């Protein structure tokens, strides 16, 4: 913040709900709690300029957890190949994936 | 002001009632034994799981079994 | 089967409304020292059927200046909304069990007003505009306090679910804890259904007929069907919220029948008032509500926020 | 793509005339269209055909200035033996200014535009040789 | 989520476009602003529900509150311009050109 | 799926009644019948002209009060908190501020209709 | 990057309760009393490891304890229990308040025949101690080493050299 | 009366929530095994 | 059902398109009512509830007041609908077809990206706490009474100041 | 306005920016922006004349659009990074839109056509607030995100606004519009130096405020609002001419006066960063400002314009309006260069 009134006075008007890893009602952690925590603890201390290069792995994991682009790519590719193989006639959907399974408790 | 209050009581009873009820809404919570118990009850209600904590051998108060005497007791809620 | 349940929930409600019309006419006649409908069928039972057939066989007008789309849509919306609102009401088991049933009721009721607004604007007639813009003020009046009253009463229920009120009133009516609010809620229902002493959107005396002046035949009949179904609905909501029936898991029939008795009582009281009182003016209604109920309503909401705390009687959630 | 515009400096001047002329003509046309969009959005015209005539005139004028500039610059660099001499861009900018004056039917614009546009082009060339950077990034 | 966010961003873009290009009635411009408000609230709501971030669900309601306050101010300004000129046409709002 | 089914059924019932009402009756359309209604005499002017709203101020105030309603509607879940004192103080401040705004408007004649 | 390590279908096999939700509710309180150490060890495993693949062996002990508990009930207090959970299943939300008499019958039957005791209102929800030889998982998050902070300039402040070296101002 | 009845309901709600807490460990293990089985089935099919 | 959410978002886009084209304020209000309903449905389908219902309520109230204002000030002898103006009609159809074609183009260029019509409906919900109880959005919103009181303070002040500002603008 | 409205409205105008500069959360910065926007309008429309209403409407529409664009930026940044603050990894378009919308709020070109009209419409004592106090919040929002801004966009906007303000100043005869255009130019400098060293952006903001407030109070003294009207100060109030001249020249930016320090230091930083072309062009075009200030100086202080018969009674009557703050700010703005090192 431009003027650090809150840090100066020791109060926390709005600094406690900045990210997904902050305290949630009834201790229900948000999606990607672990990833965000890792990224932020990695990036503490070192400046932003250094973090942008030295916490990149953590940030990449975090964005993957939150948006999930690569997961969508992977599932799309798997189901695309499934469709191609099925149209060719070289694959069958197993019983458990088809609709009849031995349902587990 | 006895005169103005007495007149208000008859000519604008609605506002007299509203202001009186608002005043009571503020006054009573401070003046009441039971107020402390609301937060205790809401803390008693167990929405989430009680997470066990590993016994390092030097934790003397937290019990080992739920039926052990040690630990918080809701007798106060039972006979509030 | 769910469709059979839908039929059992719709058809009886529509018939009950149909005969609410007859009951109104006969009660008013007797209170005014006349007998009312009693020649069409035995004791006038067939009067609603004759009326409905006549209305749906009369030519539906399509006035030149009107906007056909809205002029046709509005009655459909009125009947659809009035019928829909009966969906989640526990009697004692709701057909559809909604967690936020009260908010759903409020949303549907609020959208109800748009039937009147659009019909009046689409009529493209001066009396239609008068009716529509009177309905606007009627909404501006009741809607401010209806939500607060529901909040205050639900502050003893702990959740917006209707079914929870069945258990809330297990050993007592909510009327006793909140009779001051029950009265304001009753007047608010009187305003919302657009009925006397608050029937200012169709007041025959001032506007030949309000929003429905240019409507005729079946398109007209839908408006009145929705009006009377809404009367029954709102009195059912009062009966469930306040004046809780007797619920014992052993017999839901007891709850159903007791609810019927009380709902008929209140619906009769609506007509009682209609015949007993004059008509408010459409600025006096707003003045009444804003300058009498709202000052009291806010104080009561404050007090009912305080009550669960200083009495240590927080409602349970779930 | 920006590849088309950055291709202007693929090979020093005096070569690939036609290509460089195309590139400068496109750049002039783009500038003219932008200016025309501003001049129509503000100061509207009575008729929509008037507006489209205005956009056409602005666009064609700007394209003509750019085409003449590129052509003259490349022709100078080619006919004379100096590829990277800013005097070439100066002559091209003067040609652009004169073309603007002709398009506007005015000799004063011809002269003023010659001086100003020629200086601008010469300074551009000088910057490209000397490594000047417009719109730099914070270095401190 | 992805397709929903794309369509919602397009909706906000269209409402912004509608606001930027007028069409005589100022009331319609106010309605377009109000529609952008709707789209932004929906964006925030879906983002929070997707992330299970219940600490950021207090914020869409603040968006609604402040958007309502500004819409009320806009309506009051419409009332004043109407009192001045007899209509809400934006053409009449041209005095300050000089 | 049940709520969708029942709402669509209601829609279809209403629309079917309308269609029957429009295709069953015998009709005769002519200009005098169709022309608008105004107590038996022709319209002196169309009904689309401006219609002054004498309660504009109260109408706008309704917007803000309804947003206050929105801010207050979470109270049933709020009371299930541990910071009951904080919740009480905040709700009391909110409602008292509501009351003060209404009182100022009243004393300033906001609710008196404009003539 | 690396191939995930899912356990095999064979090691994800265990005898399973196959008893309905109403039954579990009816048996909950005594099932919370007895079978506490096993469940609590498994729960500590879940929370400490954070990896579902690393607590399977303890989860199967949980299942075995549940089977033992229910087998004992079926052996001794079977009929009262069937009555109790039938009455519970009937209720809309499986509320206890509706079947108290049958609850009393079942509770007495277990108390005398099997020696069990029901927990009071405030028993099953208190945090408890747990004993395990499973070591505390270090680096549970598989956290990478935290990057080292910037070096910190250390010294004692001194007046600026030749004053505020701004263009021409002497100081 | 509402105060007393609400307090009774609070006690009953605590009782039910305690029942849920008692049973949760079984559900967590069952969910663990079920989700792992689903994942491994997916892996096999992906392999093919 | 697979196309449920995408259809709702497209309907929202169409309602917003109509609003942008800006017919008479009456039709604008009607269009925004339909759009608010569809948005409430999208929020409901995304696991929300209170937020969707609140948007619907507040928007119904807002459009009520707006309609009242339009009948008085924003009115014309011949209000223009969407279809009345041929340019509005043509651009309505153009926008619909343009969005259809843009959807196709984005799908083709990025088979998986902003839009995944193939695989649509496979990513609506990401995670849910299966055995939770307190996960309802009303709880998060009510947090303003405990953990985010600053939000309440600023919003309440906004409404309070709004009262005075509105009165003095309308003086 | 009754006292309670004055208290609440002024307090909210003061609150908004303070919230913006003391909020760590983007939504709360947006809340501060909305506070300022809502609260200013009643002060603008206090007069209730036809021009005042139109000025208030223009302000409302423009600022509402800007706020919505900023809110879109905030929401999309949330969608991306699960947080309410802009990070280095934030998508570039989000920051571009934020800069663009805060530019619209600030009045920078080419989103500058709205400021002159509103300033012309509204009275002077509110023009001061509009051209001083309402810029602190948006510029604070930018400064808090300075390391991530786009040099190309910022320099383009800055140079555009310098050129546009300089050219617009000449034509105008109205003092209110002249001060609007001066505001545009000085903001152009501020944003030009923002991405490189925001300390100097804040220095320029301070000096511009400290120079504009005295001038606005000078205009308020005799409600002067035109070149012709201000020309009569040699008769109505001779004393002020010296300081008015000095202050106009300073705003123009002549060396001995303070106005040089902002421009000189900013040019120095830009040159350090190798921004030679933009620095040269901005310095060159900042001289039209001196031209259209020198015309004012000629009209008021150096030449004596024709006066009216009735000014004699203005002479007769007494005056008690100039404040202490006028003298303090005027001297401390036009006689402080020798203390420049301490300022930077
Ligand atoms: C430089 C820019 C010059 C702009 C032209 C100003 C001008 O024409 O003056 C008005 C001129 C009209 O003069 P006038 O009609 O004879 O009556 C005006 C007097 O103020 C009539 O009022 P008075 O006679 O009652 O008061 C006279 C006053 C004398 O006051 C003045 O009127 C002259 C003030 C300007 C002095 C300029 C100093 C130059 C600094 C050099 C560095 O006091 C004195 O006689 C001696 C006091 C010591 C001088 C005052 C200095 C105080 C301020 C210093 C600030 C320095 C800022 C730099 O036109
Ligand atoms: C809701 C949709 C809002 C978003 C924009 C819709 C874009 C598609 C509209 C197609 C064009 C319709 C049109 O031209 O308007 C004509 C009409 C006005 O018609 P009219 O009043 O001029 O009369 C027509 C007379 N004849 C037949 C002789 C030509 O307006 C509408 O269609 C809007 C009706 C609302 C439709 C939505 C119903 C939702 C249910 C209620 C909630
Ligand atoms: C539960 C109560 C609510 C129910 C609402 C629904 C009402 C259902 C009523 C059932 C009776 C259905 C027959 C209604 C006929 C009404 C219109 C009519 O009489 O048209 C006569 C018409 C008259 O025939 P026509 O056209 O030769 O008459 C002469 C026409 N002119 C004047 C133009 C020369 O006959 C029909 O074709 C009607 C067919 C009905 C099937
Ligand atoms: C002529 C025009 C006629 C127009 C008629 C329009 C009728 C609208 C009636 C008013 C509806 C406004 C309120 C919003 C819809 C209802 C929201 C709701 O009550 O919740 C929907 C519910 C999801 O929540 P819920 O099930 O209660 O709790 C979760 C655990 N069960 O379950 C659902 O998700 C169901 C969602 C669908 C709700 C009905 C949609 C109707 C669409 C009609 C077109
Ligand atoms: C990043 C990419 C940068 C691209 C820069 C493109 C520069 C285009 C040239 C500047 C546009 C000026 C518009 C114009 O031509 O003026 C029109 C109008 C004058 O009216 P008129 O007589 O009709 O037109 C005469 C024009 N010779 O006068 C006007 O309309 C006033 C225009 C003021 C705003 C111009 C903004 C230009 C820079 C935009 C940067 C984004
Ligand atoms: C791209 C063009 C979008 C539609 C252009 C409509 C016609 C037009 O001139 O644009 C400005 C328009 C105001 O047009 P108007 O004042 O009614 O005068 C028309 C004179 N032929 O302004 C408008 O009507 C608002 C247009 C909003 C378009 C939103 C949907 C665009 C879909 C593509």
């Amino acid at each position: 913040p431009f003027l650090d009134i809150q840090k100066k006075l020791g109060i926390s008007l709005d600094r406690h709900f900045m990210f997904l890893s902050a305290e949630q009602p009834y201790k229900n952690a948000a999606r990607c709690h672990a990833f965000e925590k890792e990224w932020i603890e990695c990036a503490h201390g070192i400046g932003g300029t250094r973090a942008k290069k030295e916490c990149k792995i953590e940030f990449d994991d975090f964005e993957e957890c939150l948006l999930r682009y690569k997961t969508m790519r992977r599932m799309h590719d798997i189901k695309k190949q499934r469709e191609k193989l099925m149209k060719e006639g070289k694959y069958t959907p197993p019983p458990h994936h088809s609709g009849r399974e031995e349902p587990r408790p | 002001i006895s005169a103005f209050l007495k007149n208000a009581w008859a000519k604008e009873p609605v506002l007299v009632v509203s202001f009186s009820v608002w005043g009571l809404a503020i006054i009573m919570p401070m003046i009441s034994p039971y107020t402390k118990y609301a937060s205790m009850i809401n803390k008693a209600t167990p929405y989430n799981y009680p997470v066990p904590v590993r016994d390092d051998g030097n934790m003397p108060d937290v019990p080992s079994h739920p039926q052990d005497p040690l630990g918080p007791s809701l007798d106060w809620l039972k006979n509030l | 089967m769910f469709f059979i349940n839908i039929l059992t929930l719709l058809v009886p409600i529509l018939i009950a409304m149909a005969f609410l019309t007859l009951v109104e006419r006969k009660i008013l006649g007797y209170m005014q020292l006349r007998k009312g409908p009693n020649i069409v069928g035995p004791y006038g039972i067939l009067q609603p059927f004759a009326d409905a057939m006549k209305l749906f066989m009369k030519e539906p007008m399509r006035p030149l200046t009107t906007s056909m789309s809205l002029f046709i849509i509005a009655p459909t919306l009125s009947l659809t909304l009035a019928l829909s609102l009966w969906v989640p009401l526990p009697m004692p088991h709701p057909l559809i069990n909604l967690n936020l049933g009260i908010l759903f009721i409020l949303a549907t009721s609020s959208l109800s007003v748009y039937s009147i607004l659009w019909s009046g604007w689409a009529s493209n007639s001066k009396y239609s505009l008068f009716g529509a813009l009177r309905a606007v003020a009627q909404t501006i009046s009741y809607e401010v306090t209806m939500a607060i009253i529901l909040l205050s009463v639900l502050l003893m229920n702990g959740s917006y679910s209707l079914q929870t009120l069945i258990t809330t009133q297990e050993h007592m009516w909510l009327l006793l804890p909140a009779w001051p609010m029950a009265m304001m809620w009753f007047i608010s229902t009187l305003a919302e259904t657009n009925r006397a002493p608050f029937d200012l959107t169709e007041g025959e005396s001032e506007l030949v007929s309000g929003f429905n002046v240019e409507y005729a035949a079946g398109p007209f009949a839908l408006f009145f069907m929705a009006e009377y179904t809404n009367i029954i609905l709102m009195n059912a909501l009062t009966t469930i919220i306040f004046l809780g029936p007797l619920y014992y898991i052993n017999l839901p029939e007891l709850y159903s029948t007791n609810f019927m008795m009380e709902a008929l009582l209140l619906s009769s009281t609506f007509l009682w008032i209609r015949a007993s009182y004059p008509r408010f003016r459409y600025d006096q209604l707003m003045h009444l509500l804003w300058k009498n109920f709202l000052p009291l309503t806010l104080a009561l909401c404050m007090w009912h926020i305080s009550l669960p705390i200083f009495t240590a009687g927080v409602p349970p959630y779930m | 793509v920006k590849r088309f515009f950055e291709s202007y400096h693929e090979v020093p001047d005096g070569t690939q005339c036609h290509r460089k002329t195309y590139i400068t003509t496109a750049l002039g046309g783009i500038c003219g269209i932008i200016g025309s969009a501003y001049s129509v959005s503000l100061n509207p015209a009575d008729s929509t055909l008037e507006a489209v005539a205005r956009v056409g005139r602005y666009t064609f004028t700007a394209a003509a200035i750019g085409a003449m500039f590129g052509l003259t610059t490349c022709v100078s660099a080619q006919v004379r033996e100096k590829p990277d001499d800013p005097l070439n861009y100066f002559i091209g900018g003067c040609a652009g200014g004169l073309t603007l004056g002709a398009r506007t039917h005015s000799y004063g614009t011809a002269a003023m535009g010659c001086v100003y546009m020629g200086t601008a082009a010469a300074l551009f060339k000088i910057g490209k040789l000397e490594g000047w950077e417009l719109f730099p990034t914070p270095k401190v | 989520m992805p397709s929903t966010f794309f369509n919602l961003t397009m909706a906000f873009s269209l409402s912004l476009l509608g606001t930027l290009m007028f069409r005589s009635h100022l009331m319609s411009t106010l309605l377009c602003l109000e529609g952008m408000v709707l789209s932004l609230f929906i964006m925030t709501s879906v983002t929070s529900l997707n992330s299970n971030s219940m600490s950021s669900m207090p914020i869409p309601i603040t968006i609604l509150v402040f958007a309502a306050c500004e819409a009320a101010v806009g309506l009051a300004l419409l009332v004043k311009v109407s009192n001045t000129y007899g209509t809400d046409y934006v053409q009449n709002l041209n005095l300050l050109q000089c | 799926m049940n709520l969708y089914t029942v709402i669509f059924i209601n829609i279809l019932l209403s629309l079917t009644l309308i269609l029957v009402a429009f295709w069953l009756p015998q009709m005769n359309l002519y200009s005098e019948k169709a022309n608008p209604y105004e107590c038996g005499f022709d319209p002196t002017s169309s009904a689309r002209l401006p219609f002054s709203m004498k309660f504009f101020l109260v109408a706008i105030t309704f917007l803000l009060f309804d947003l206050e309603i929105a801010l207050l509607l979470p109270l049933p879940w709020a009371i299930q908190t541990i910071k009951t004192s904080t919740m009480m103080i905040m709700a009391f401040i909110l409602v008292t501020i509501l009351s003060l705004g209404l009182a100022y408007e009243w004393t300033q004649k906001g609710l008196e209709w404009t003539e | 990057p690396g191939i995930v390590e899912l356990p095999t279908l064979e090691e994800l096999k265990v005898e399973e309760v196959k008893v309905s939700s109403a039954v579990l509710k009816a048996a909950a309180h005594h099932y919370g009393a007895q079978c506490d150490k096993t469940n609590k060890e498994f729960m500590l495993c879940r929370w400490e490891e954070k990896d579902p693949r690393r607590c399977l062996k303890e989860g199967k002990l949980v299942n075995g304890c549940a089977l033992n508990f229910f087998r004992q009930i079926k052996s001794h207090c079977a009929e009262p229990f069937t009555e109790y959970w039938t009455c519970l299943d009937y209720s809309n939300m499986q509320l206890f308040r509706h079947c108290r008499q049958q609850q009393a019958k079942f509770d007495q039957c277990v108390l005398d025949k099997l020696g069990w005791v029901r927990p009071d209102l405030g028993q099953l929800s208190k945090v408890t101690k747990v004993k395990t030889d499973r070591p505390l998982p270090e680096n549970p998050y598989h956290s990478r080493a935290r990057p080292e902070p910037n070096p910190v300039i250390e010294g004692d402040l001194k007046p600026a050299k030749h004053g505020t070296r701004f263009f021409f101002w002497t100081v | 009366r509402m105060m007393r009845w609400n307090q009774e309901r609070r006690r009953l709600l605590i009782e039910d929530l305690e029942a849920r807490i008692a049973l949760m460990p079984l559900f967590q293990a069952e969910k663990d095994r079920r989700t792992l089985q689903i994942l491994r089935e997916n892996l096999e099919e992906e392999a093919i | 059902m697979n196309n449920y959410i995408f259809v709702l978002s497209s309907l929202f886009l169409v309602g917003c398109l109509g609003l942008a084209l800006k017919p008479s304020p009456i039709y604008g209000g009607l269009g925004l009512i339909v759009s608010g309903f569809v948005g409430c449905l999208m929020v409901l389908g995304f696991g929300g509830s209170f937020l969707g219902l609140m948007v619907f309520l507040i928007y119904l109230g807002g459009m009520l007041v707006v309609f009242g204002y339009t009948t008085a000030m924003a009115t014309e002898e011949y209000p223009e609908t969407w279809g009345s103006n041929w340019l509005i009609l043509g651009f309505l159809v153009l926008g619909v077809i343009m969005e259809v074609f843009l959807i196709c183009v984005l799908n083709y260029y990025d088979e998986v990206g902003v839009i995944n019509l193939d695989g649509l409906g496979d990513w609506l919900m990401y995670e849910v706490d299966d055995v939770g109880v307190m996960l309802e959005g009303g709880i998060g919103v009510a947090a303003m009474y405990s953990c985010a009181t600053w939000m309440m303070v600023v919003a309440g002040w906004s409404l309070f100041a709004g009262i005075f500002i509105i009165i003095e603008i309308t003086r | 306005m009754n006292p309670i409205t004055l208290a609440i409205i002024y307090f909210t105008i003061f609150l908004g920016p303070v919230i913006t500069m003391s909020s760590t959360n983007l939504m709360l910065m947006w809340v501060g922006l909305e506070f300022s926007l809502l609260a200013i309008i009643p002060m603008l429309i206090n007069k209730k004349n036809p021009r005042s209403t139109e000025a208030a409407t223009k302000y409302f529409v423009t600022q509402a659009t800007a706020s919505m664009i900023i809110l879109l930026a905030i929401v999309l940044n949330y969608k991306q990074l699960g947080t309410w603050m802009f990070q280095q990894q934030t998508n570039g378009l989000i920051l571009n839109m934020t800069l663009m919308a805060l530019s619209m709020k600030l009045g920078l070109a080419p989103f500058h056509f709205w400021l002159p009209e509103v300033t012309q419409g509204i009275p002077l004592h509110m023009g001061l607030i509009l051209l001083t106090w309402q810029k602190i919040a948006p510029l604070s929002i930018l400064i808090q995100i300075y390391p991530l801004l786009n040099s190309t966009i910022i320099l383009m906007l800055a140079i555009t606004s310098i050129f546009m303000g300089a050219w617009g100043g000449l034509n105008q005869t109205q003092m209110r519009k002249i001060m609007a255009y001066s505001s545009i130019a000085h903001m152009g400098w501020m944003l030009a130096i923002l991405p490189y060293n925001p300390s100097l952006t804040l220095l320029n903001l301070m000096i511009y405020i400290i120079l504009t407030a005295p001038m606005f109070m000078a205009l308020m003294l005799n409600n002067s609002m035109t070149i012709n009207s201000i020309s009569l100060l040699w008769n109505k109030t001779p004393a002020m001419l010296t300081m008015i001249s000095l202050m106009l020249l300073s705003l123009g930016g002549l060396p001995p006066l303070t106005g040089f320090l902002p421009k000189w230091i900013i040019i120095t930083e830009l040159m350090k960063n190798n921004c030679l072309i933009m620095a040269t062009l901005m310095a060159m075009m900042a001289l039209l400002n001196l031209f259209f200030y020198t015309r004012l100086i000629y009209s008021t202080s150096l030449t004596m314009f024709p006066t009216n018969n009735n000014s004699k009674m203005m002479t007769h009557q007494t005056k008690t309006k100039p404040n202490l703050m006028f003298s303090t700010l005027a001297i401390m703005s036009t006689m402080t260069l020798p203390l420049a090192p301490q300022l930077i």
Side-chain angles (χ1 to χ4, degrees), chain I residues 150-151 154 157-158 160-161 164-165 168-169 171, chain J residues 1-2 5 8 11-12 19 28 35 38 42 48:
Chain I
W150 185 231
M151 274 315 75
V154 293
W157 190 262
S158 166
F160 191 47
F164 300 82
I165 301 150
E168 303 226 359
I169 292 169
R171 202 178 300 292
Chain J
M1 312 199 183
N2 40 283
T5 311
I8 282 147
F11 172 82
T12 291
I19 279 171
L28 272 154
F35 266 132
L38 292 130
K48 298 278 177 24

Side-chain angles (χ1 to χ4, degrees), chain E residues 6-7 9-11 13-14, chain I residues 6 13 94-110 114-117:
Chain E
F6 184 76
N7 294 18
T9 310
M10 225 49 226
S13 323
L14 284 163
Chain I
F6 179 81
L13 198 58
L94 161 59
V96 168
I97 300 309
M98 181 76 168
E99 304 336 323
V100 165
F101 154 81
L102 203 173
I103 293 291
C104 300
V105 171
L106 282 163
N107 200 358
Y108 197 107
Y109 264 28
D110 206 3
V114 283
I115 279 157
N116 208 7
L117 202 171

Side-chain angles (χ1 to χ4, degrees), chain C residues 248-275:
Chain C
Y248 301 121
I249 196 160
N250 93 349
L251 304 134
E253 300 82 17
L254 182 61
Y255 188 97
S256 313
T257 315
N258 198 345
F259 153 83
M260 161 293 288
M261 280 176 28
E262 294 195 80
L264 282 36
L265 169 76
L266 273 79
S267 291
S268 97
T269 293
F270 265 43
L271 330 170
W272 195 4
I273 287 159
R274 174 191 221 281

Side-chain angles (χ1 to χ4, degrees), chain E residues 34-70:
Chain E
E34 162 46 11
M36 311 195 308
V37 171
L38 184 53
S39 50
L40 287 181
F41 179 98
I42 298 284
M43 311 215 178
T44 317
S45 313
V46 200
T47 302
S48 303
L49 296 158
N50 171 223
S51 305
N52 303 299
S53 173
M54 325 205 327
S55 90
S56 79
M57 270 165 237
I59 273 150
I61 292 286
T62 312
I63 277 175
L64 280 187
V65 169
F66 273 83
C69 275
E70 82 185 49

